[PDB]
Amino acid sequence: INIDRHATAQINMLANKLMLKSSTAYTQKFGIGMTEWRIISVLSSASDCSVQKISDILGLDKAAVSRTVKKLEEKKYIEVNGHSEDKRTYAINLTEMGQELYEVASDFAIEREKQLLEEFEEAEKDQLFILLKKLRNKVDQM
């Protein structure tokens, strides 16, 4: 059966294989899984990361984010910031060790991304981001 022109199928097989390889890579190099890495990278980039905000950004459901954030808490990479004395909700933050992890693992993330796009011309990269965002806009409508 031909699913070459099946966008969902193509994108899912691409994403799944990339994620599986990354699971191995991050685990062997840094002792964390791919999903742990995705969350750490979100925490380094954004402010007031609730579980909701991390889920919105990554597309993983809240249960998945919550379970991973708990693991990262146990590994002492993140801590829950209650903001007890502030007119705002709790937030998840990197600990000092989680920040160090990000510092060292981000170089590896950057190299893998460079590798993924090795054969792309500059305009092809631009075209790629535009088309993914168009897809991302339609999905939000479905």
Q: Rule CB under 8 A: which of 14-73 touch a second copy?
A: 14-24, 27, 33-36, 38, 41-42, 44-46, 49, 52-53, 56-61, 63-65, 67-68
The nearest distance, CB 75 to a second copy, in angstroms, is 14
State which residue, 59 or 82, has the beta carbon closest to a second copy.
59
State which residue, 5 or 87, has the beta carbon closest to a second copy.
5
**d(C-alpha 120, C-alpha 77), whole Å:** 35
74 binds a second copy (CB under 8 A): no
CA dist 29 → 49, 68, 80, 84 (Å): 26, 19, 26, 37
Count, in order, helices (H) and strands (E) of the chain: 6, 2
- Binding-site size for a second copy (CB under 8 A) equals 79
State which residue, 3 or 86, has the beta carbon closest to a second copy.
3
